Amino acid sequence: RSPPKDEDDLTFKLDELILDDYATELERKHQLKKRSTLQIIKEELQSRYREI
Amino acid sequence: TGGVMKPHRYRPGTVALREIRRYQKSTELLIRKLPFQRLVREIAQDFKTDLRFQSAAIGALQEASEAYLVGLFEDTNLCAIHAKRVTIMPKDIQLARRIRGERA
Amino acid sequence: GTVALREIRRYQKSTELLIRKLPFQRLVREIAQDFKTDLRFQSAAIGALQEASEAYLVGLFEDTNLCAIHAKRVTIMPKDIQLARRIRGER
Amino acid sequence: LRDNIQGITKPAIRRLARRGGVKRISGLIYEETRGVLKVFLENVIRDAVTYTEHAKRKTVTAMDVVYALKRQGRTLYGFGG
Amino acid sequence: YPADKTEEALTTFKTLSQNSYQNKTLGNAHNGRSTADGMSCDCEENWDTVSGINNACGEYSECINRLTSIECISGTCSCGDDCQNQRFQKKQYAPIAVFETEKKGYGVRAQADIRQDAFIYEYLGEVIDESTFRKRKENYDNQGLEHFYFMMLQKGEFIDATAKGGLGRFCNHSCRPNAYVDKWEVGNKLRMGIFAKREIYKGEEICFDYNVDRYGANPQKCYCGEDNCIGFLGGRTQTDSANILPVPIAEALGSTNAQEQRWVRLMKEQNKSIKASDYSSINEDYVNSLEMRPIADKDEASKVTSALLKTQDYIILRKLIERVSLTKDPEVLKEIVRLRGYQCVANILTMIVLDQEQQQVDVESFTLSVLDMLESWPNSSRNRISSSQIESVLESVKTKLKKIQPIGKKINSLLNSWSKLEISYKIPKSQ
Ligand SMILES: Nc1ncnc2c1ncn2[C@@H]1O[C@H](CSCC[C@H](N)C(=O)O)[C@@H](O)[C@H]1O
Ligand SMILES: [Zn+2]
Ligand SMILES: [Zn+2]
Numbered sequence: 124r125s126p127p128k129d130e131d132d133l134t135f136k137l138d139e140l141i142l143d144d145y146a147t148e149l150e151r152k153h154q155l156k157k158r159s160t161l162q163i164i165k166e167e168l169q170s171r172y173r174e175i
Numbered sequence: 176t177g178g179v180m181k182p183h184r185y186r187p188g189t190v191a192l193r194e195i196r197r198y199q200k201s202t203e204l205l206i207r208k209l210p211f212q213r214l215v216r217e218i219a220q221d222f223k224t225d226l227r228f229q230s231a232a233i234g235a236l237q238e239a240s241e242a243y244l245v246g247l248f249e250d251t252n253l254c255a256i257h258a259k260r261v262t263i264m265p266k267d268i269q270l271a272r273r274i275r276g277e278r279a
Numbered sequence: 280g281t282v283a284l285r286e287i288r289r290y291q292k293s294t295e296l297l298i299r300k301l302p303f304q305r306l307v308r309e310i311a312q313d314f315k316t317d318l319r320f321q322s323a324a325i326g327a328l329q330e331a332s333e334a335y336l337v338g339l340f341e342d343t344n345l346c347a348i349h350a351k352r353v354t355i356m357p358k359d360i361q362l363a364r365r366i367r368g369e370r
Numbered sequence: 371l372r373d374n375i376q377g378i379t380k381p382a383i384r385r386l387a388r389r390g391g392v393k394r395i396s397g398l399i400y401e402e403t404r405g406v407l408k409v410f411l412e413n414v415i416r417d418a419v420t421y422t423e424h425a426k427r428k429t430v431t432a433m434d435v436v437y438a439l440k441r442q443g444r445t446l447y448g449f450g451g
Numbered sequence: 452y453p454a455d456k457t458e459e460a461l462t463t464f465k466t467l468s469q470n471s472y473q474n475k476t477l478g479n480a481h482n483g484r485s486t487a488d489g490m491s492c493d494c495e496e497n498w499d500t501v502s503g504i505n506n507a508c509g510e511y512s513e514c515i516n517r518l519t520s521i522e523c524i525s526g527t528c529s530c531g532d533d534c535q536n537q538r539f540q541k542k543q544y545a546p547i548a549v550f551e552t553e554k555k556g557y558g559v560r561a562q563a564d565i566r567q568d569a570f571i572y573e574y575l576g577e578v579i580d581e582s583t584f585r586k587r588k589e590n591y592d593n594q595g596l597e598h599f600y601f602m603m604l605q606k607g608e609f610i611d612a613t614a615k616g617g618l619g620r621f622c623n624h625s626c627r628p629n630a631y632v633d634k635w636e637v638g639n640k641l642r643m644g645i646f647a648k649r650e651i652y653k654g655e656e657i658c659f660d661y662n663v664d665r666y667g668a669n670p671q672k673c674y675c676g677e678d679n680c681i682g683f684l685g686g687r688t689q690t691d692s693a694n695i696l697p698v699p700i701a702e703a704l705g706s707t708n709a710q711e712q713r714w715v716r717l718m719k720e721q722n723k724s725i726k727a728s729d730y731s732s733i734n735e736d737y738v739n740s741l742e743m744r745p746i747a748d749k750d751e752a753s754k755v756t757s758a759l760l761k762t763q764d765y766i767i768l769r770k771l772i773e774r775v776s777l778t779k780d781p782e783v784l785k786e787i788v789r790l791r792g793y794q795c796v797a798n799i800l801t802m803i804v805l806d807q808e809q810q811q812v813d814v815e816s817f818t819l820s821v822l823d824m825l826e827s828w829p830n831s832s833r834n835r836i837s838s839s840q841i842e843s844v845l846e847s848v849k850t851k852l853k854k855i856q857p858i859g860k861k862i863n864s865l866l867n868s869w870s871k872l873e874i875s876y877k878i879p880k881s882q
């Protein structure tokens with residue numbers, strides 16, 4: 124509702140996330156291999172339905 | 176949401192300066208007639224009773240007392256202004272009476 | 280400060296005139312000249328004028344000291360002079 | 371008549387001070403103004419009373435009041451002086 | 452910046468150039484007493500021959516009428532015509548624009564830099580009596596309007612800015628305003644002007660304090676964004692029995708306008724002392740005598756959290772904690788967890804059982820009355836506690852009151868239960 128200077132949305136904060144530790148904890152707790160899925164989610168959140 | 180915004184209050188001195196202009200423009204008596212008449216009778220009772228007081232004598236006494244009090248307050252305002260204040264105090268009244276010679 | 284109290288005590292205990300006679304005499308003659316010329320003066324009239332002016336100035340200085348005391352000061356100022364004169368009724 | 375010095379009420383003395391150009395009023399001044407008004411009224415009333423007593427009368431007239439005031443250097447115009 | 456909405460705002464109402472009167476008697480100065488000796492300033496007219504402008508009665512001039520909030524009238528004052536103290540009559544408003552705000556709707560912004568004490572804009576509207584005001588207020592409440600449009604010109608005389616008025620109706624409330632409303636006398640009439648409290652730059656919003664009398668209306672939350680905001684729009688309520696404690700705090704205790712009425716009606720009218728409206732001093736007897744009912748609404752839980760963050764009184768906190776003990780709705784408790792109720796309960800403990808303004812037995816009763824719901828609330832992760840670290844406070848208070856063994860054993864059970872919980876995983880961030 125109040126984007127910062129020269130930014131359309133807060134999707135740029137996703138690049139600070141450490142997806143590797145999140146994938147490791149997901150694999151430990153739930154036995155899910157989701158390392159590529161976090162990257163796909165990040166790319167889709169940064170730009171919804173790009174032209175691939 | 177039917178509330179009312181309030182007009183707030185005046186600053187201290189604005190209504191004071193207004194009423195200053197109003198009382199300095201108009202000339203009516205500021206002391207109530209009947210309490211002043213009772214006070215004059217109370218003072219006169221201390222010397223000799225059964226003393227009737229004509230209306231013109233009471234009016235002359237009221238006019239003289241108002242003139243004296245207005246002059247004393249003008250002098251006391253000058254005293255307060257001299258002491259870098261805007262509020263008059265009893266010490267200015269006593270000093271004004273002292274320099275005027277009324278108080279020894 | 281000490282010699283101020285010494286002077287106050289000495290002059291308040293003394294009774295002789297503090298204004299010098301000859302300058303005051305010349306001042307009186309100079310003032311009186313412009314009302315009428317070739318004016319003669321008795322000595323007693325000049326002495327009476329001196330005594331009255333000294334008494335008046337002493338009273339004015341006392342009231343001025345009171346005015347100076349009012350303003351939380353110890354030094355008298357010209358504004359005290361015109362305050363005392365204004366309240367006393369001189370113009 | 372018992373202690374009617376309070377009849378000189380606080381708004382009235384405020385008005386009297388206000389005519390003199392005074393902007394602010396201390397809370398302790400009212401008793402002082404009542405006292406000085408009592409003193410002045412006492413003096414003028416005393417002089418008027420002895421003026422009336424010399425005249426062999428029982429009622430103080432305006433002429434005695436104006437005479438007493440003029441004798442105190444407070445000459446009043448408008449009341450038959 | 453935000454797009455201009457000046458014409459769009461103007462189309463929403465009938466624009467007025469001057470105040471309209473329901474009748475010729477209303478709005479007259481001195482309660483209708485015509486001062487035939489109108490107050491004429493002694494200023495000499497100062498005409499600048501180059502510009503042909505009469506500079507008399509200016510801002511830095513010594514015009515007595517200007518100081519006393521009275522406007523000069525042409526043909527009656529020595530200042531002459533077109534003096535610099537005819538701001539209302541000449542309608543010399545400051546240049547302003549309307550812009551749409553994020554939450555407050557339309558708002559007024561300064562199109563130019565405006566000096567201190569400068570006249571901004573004359574508040575315009577219809578001058579109406581009290582009965583007409585009541586009728587219009589009832590009609591607008593039926594219409595569901597969520598905006599104030601009434602200002603008190605004086606006692607018994609109001610100004611309505613709903614259907615007809617000026618740009619001043621779009622000014623929004625600020626708890627630290629840059630402008631203020633003042634009352635002035637123009638001729639035999641009374642006007643309400645808006646003056647600059649400070650120096651205002653171009654583009655900045657122009658705001659004034661509403662100081663609004665609710666007349667019994669419900670509070671409206673204030674979204675001004677000022678740091679000194681009280682959180683609600685309001686002002687001194689009805690003359691007596693209207694409030695004993697602040698609303699959020701009163702509604703936190705389950706009290707309402709009726710319960711705040713009832714206590715004062717039962718005692719003040721029967722020769723027992725209740726002080727004036729002031730929330731700096733808490734009356735413990737009212738809080739003890741208040742009735743308590745369980746909470747089942749999340750806004751009431753938010754008001755409870757605000758009361759915990761605000762009130763310092765021992766007795767109000769006791770009764771709020773007792774009401775929480777009666778409360779058993781899990782969703783309200785989850786909301787309190789989201790509001791971090793444990794954080795507030797830590798300070799509530801500390802003020803009473805670490806700072807000692809009370810007696811040890813009563814503090815022990817308080818501690819036993821506050822450990823129970825802490826034992827009872829649903830908990831699933833120490834991330835909840837980590838937002839408060841209330842366990843540290845519990846250790847400090849069991850160590851201080853070690854002689855009172857029931858408190859120690861209850862805190863033992865509580866920390867044993869809490870230590871079984873895991874911690875919610877939080878994704879590490881790059882550094
Ligand atoms: N700081 C603030 N926070 C929330 N609402 C506000 C506000 N200042 C003003 N308002 C709202 O605006 C009303 C005053 S009328 C102001 C113009 C109106 N909002 C409009 O755009 O048409 C108030 O009654 C309130 O409902
Ligand atoms: Zn003027
Ligand atoms: Zn003018």
Ligand SMILES: [Zn+2]
Binds near residue numbers: 682
């Ligand atoms: Zn606010």
